[PDB]
């Protein structure tokens, strides 16, 4: 992801 | 003087009668640390209540003691009241009468336990519980019109004419500002943002109160958002990473008027407001239509005053007139009405006396109270 | 025929429509040699993709293009798909339609580039994108039941009461097998084994698939393991060393039902299925309780079917019967559903034609594919 | 008077609590004469004096005690020769790296409770103790010792176990690498006796380059980066571009062949595993400790590397106390002298009834 | 027809590429009387009158004046072919000072002006001769002993170990034990005789304690060797004592580990997933390794250290003495190798530094 | 260590 | 609530 | 060698 997690 | 304590789902307000604004306004959350403590001498408290919880929300599991206007956890709400009555407002309740506000349609055990705790744990001299929607009229200074109360808690549309509230026309749509936060965080996953935690939900609440707005036409703004990229307003996160939201600014407010987006089968805000009027008699219908009053934190969206007027106008007869009255102090409309109510001399005989409660038991909240 | 493809965080299943088993199953990893080539006699390819990289994983920096069901790097996914069509299936996609799967609640840009790549790089006549968990009921031959899909990187439950899928209860948790593998080596250091490289990551995954299991009662089983009972097993590393794991056998799979071990506030796997059922209608719950269907590799632990049944029975009312269905071939359940869907005559009109994409660009995938 | 003993992989610091500096510090090396009234095993500073004969061997490797027969010798030397106090009346405090094998701390409790007869005991993480010395309460603690480099983020005293990262690359691994690239110039060191000569070189002349690519080209032409060192035997050696390559393995572990990321990336990943709401305070309160971070200019390089990865809006503040070499011990002095800590000592009776496993339940 | 030249620490090999055996082998010894200098077979024949001096010591050229002599002697006295037409594929031990290899590129590019040049690691070429691709290489030559593990052609630099125990050290150790029986030697010419005794009478015992007790209990292991003057000498326990110093360096006084432990430690420096392949493909090379039964003893010692389930297969072809050169012939004849040649134009643009960037 | 590294 | 919603 | 050993 972009804002949140790594993905 | 009395203590107008307007407890609510999002925040609770505390103060004194005769004032213009509440003295204490803090979030109504009770967080408990999950990570273990490793440093000695810091003296971390067992639980954090109010603004202290929000500051250290990164290591807490924020649980709201009130959901949908019903006290789910009665042990945490005793802590919130204790924090309200001792630290922020800082006056011993045993010497002053206490007034509370309560949603119109709610379990009868909720008002039952509210009286039991105050009259014994805090030993207040007197009490009185009123409808949150009704109190909005006192702030507006009018005895007629409907109040479209809607906040983090459950939305209410209570019509009152000449001070004689109509009970059969009261509607309780469970769609609220909290449901929009869940919907907004669900539709923000399309851009790659995943806020799924009790702490990150507070971040989503901040975005909704700042950049979100109501579009006059959903279909036209949908084409404008797709055709033009000028509807994007960057927002900065607490960690310093900026985010960009496009059509989600007005996509989440539109869930209020079309609850089919969240999957709920109930009608929208305008239909619920329209149905509240249609339940009333024909003769009084003229006055209640031109004196509608908004309230609560949900109705603070830019353009909701114009959008609601248009939707309710088409359903209503064309010759008739619609006047959406939107005072700028609608956030504290429930509290400000309480301040007027407590100072009135004709009402000071309506409190539940301490002796009266003990003889009749906790059931005194139905007859002596509202 | 249709080239049904089941790209995922772990091994990607690729084959043909109408078959009962995937033709080629290889890990979806891409690795490059970190060292420098010295011997010049044999070829030193720039990057090894698929089962070729697994054999020579010692000298490779294995990196997964997929993380939590989202394509993090689009350069490597082109390599994997090219390896699938031209090196495993040995067919040209220019003549055969391609079916693909995407996890629900995914970024809209993820499936936008998926359609873009095939329609311009591989030039397939048709395409379709379907939810991974939706196809799982097609393999089981049922039209009702909540799908508890648990892949390598995602764990999502989507209730399907009938031909219509409820969209307000499609939950999604990022706790899956990959996170458990990272947790297994975190608690393996408590015994003296240090796995800290991606080459050693694969060794840990083999241990999880062969020795890990779910205990019916975690607290009682903990006492038995602390007594040094027959729970201790022996595993042989590629080096030839023999390692013994005791209470770590059931501690790693226990992170699914108690995510607090990983520091995640999200509720357990048993609870997230309970929540999804509750958000459905009252009369619907009578069928979702009795038709729960597991899927994915992560639900291949011995005892996951019995343990989940006990947890749900406590939460659910006693009258309702919880019949957890665990097909013996649930590892490839998602692919088998895709094979059945493609062969159906009704599905022939759901394809995305090449001319259809030519007129509106990649935005079609949000209109026809659900 | 609670003792505070930090038995690190390198030199061990021992001294009383309530003071500001360790009482006695000496290398943790035990050596015996090579090949064939000299005593069998020389420990502590005595081994350093005769390092040209004895086979120097480190009892602790990568923060793990490898020979429990040797660790009894060093502890016997500290309590009876350096501090010269009887351990039978004072409590003893120990420091250990995080993410260590459970069998490591179990044996430490067994030894002192049975052999040294210490009435009390507590085991605390080295990173946590480092935060006491600075007087701070939050901020990640990048502790890089001789054999263990770990970053333990702490917010308001509530440690985050899932965000703790441990990297085996540390000061000792740099000593082997510097010895490897010294043979490139023409100087060869093979025996463990000569390793301590290399460690002397790394302490005095070795430093960190701000812009590593620009340093090679500049150092290739001019000899402004060449410094001359004097060997104990009288020989004078000159080392040029090797001065900055040795610590750059901290930031680019690919030189040693390790797949793990550098200290700058390890610190960045540790903060990322934490929540968004506490990333405000972790960026502005980063703390360094340990001898591996004592290179002149390492603080400046770390700030630049993290700022590139972190958003430009955020502020990266690398707190570098001047006494970061003894930060682990100094913080432990405050903990033992605190009145609140007196209820967490592992008394003899509690260990007697619960066995060696008590150390897991009463320590972090 | 690249002129593959392996300037080892004695017994340098040279010959045309594409063959299978070295054209000429002669000791890398330059001696002067105590003509002006003699090098090669003429020096060994007249070793009594000269003072033998090795230009190469421990794989590092200690004097470039003598190195030019043997190199001039190789092309103009043994091969009898000018080097102006063919490239040269030199060999150099790993982990060597860069000043050693920089001069090697410079010296021929200026004095001999060969069209091309290349420097190859002596351990890598050994694997080429056997045709394998995986498995560590034990290039225990003279002067130096190095292990360079290779897996699928990707040599791992962090696991390249270099040990200073080799044949020259063993010759000095065989010097000391022989003196205990009265067979003393002083001059460098006498030392060449001691190398002869090592080459035909030394063997690696399977174990000390059984053989040492046996050697002190009977005289079945006695061997009679005549020294080149005519008188015969008898050596006993020295047969299995000097060779075993490779495995127990404590006899020499050096602290480093033995041959078996150096191989054992080199493998653990590699990744776990490739240790299994290296254990079953160990390769041996070098003159020192030509001891009888060194593979059998190394098989046992590594097996004790290695896990029981692991399989140890010490591959050692019978012609392991010229393994480096044979591998060097294959590399020079490869079609793909013609691009890696260091051209004459590439030398002048970057000076002598071209050796580091291209090799 | 035991399985992995040296320690 | 008790029957309906979660409150 | 220069510093260490003989060569
Ligand atoms: N300025 C604003 N603009 C848009 N939405 C707002 C604004 N302020 C508050 N809200 C919404 O209203 C909610 C607060 O409701 P509030 O009126 O505080 O409830 P209560 O009546 O129980 O105090 C918040 O959750 C937020 O979503
Ligand atoms: N028999 C098994 N037992 C436990 N875990 C398994 C088993 N087989 C596979 N897994 C784990 O499940 C993960 C997902 O694999 P799978 O569901 O087959 O494909 P996908 O990654 O596409 O969902 C793998 O990473 C693997 O670690
Ligand atoms: N002034 C210095 N400059 C650079 N490196 C140093 C300096 N002092 C010590 N070191 C290195 O730091 C390493 C760890 O030292 P120390 O902090 O005493 O270990 P410990 O982790 O046990 O506290 C030593 O091996 C040494 O090489
Ligand atoms: N058959 C043998 N027995 C014992 N030692 C030998 C034998 N052959 C060669 N050696 C020794 O091995 C050493 C190295 O020989 P070689 O490998 O030909 O040279 P380099 O070390 O240059 O490769 C020589 O010094 C010689 O003494
Ligand atoms: Mg309110
Ligand atoms: Mg899957
Ligand atoms: Mg330390
Ligand atoms: Mg050789």
Numbering used by the authors:
A (entry chain J), F (entry chain I), G (entry chain K), H (entry chain H): 1 to 7
B (entry chain D), C (entry chain C): 6 to 375
D (entry chain B): 6 to 41, 48 to 375
E (entry chain A): 6 to 39, 50 to 374
Paper text:
Actin is an abundant and highly conserved protein that controls the shape and movement of all eukaryotic cells. Monomeric actin (G-actin) can polymerize into filaments (F-actin), which form a polar, double-stranded helix with a right-handed twist. F-actin exhibits two non-equivalent ends, known as the ‘barbed’ and ‘pointed’ ends. In contrast, both F-actin polymerization and disassembly are substantially slower at the SD2- and SD4-exposing pointed end of the filament.
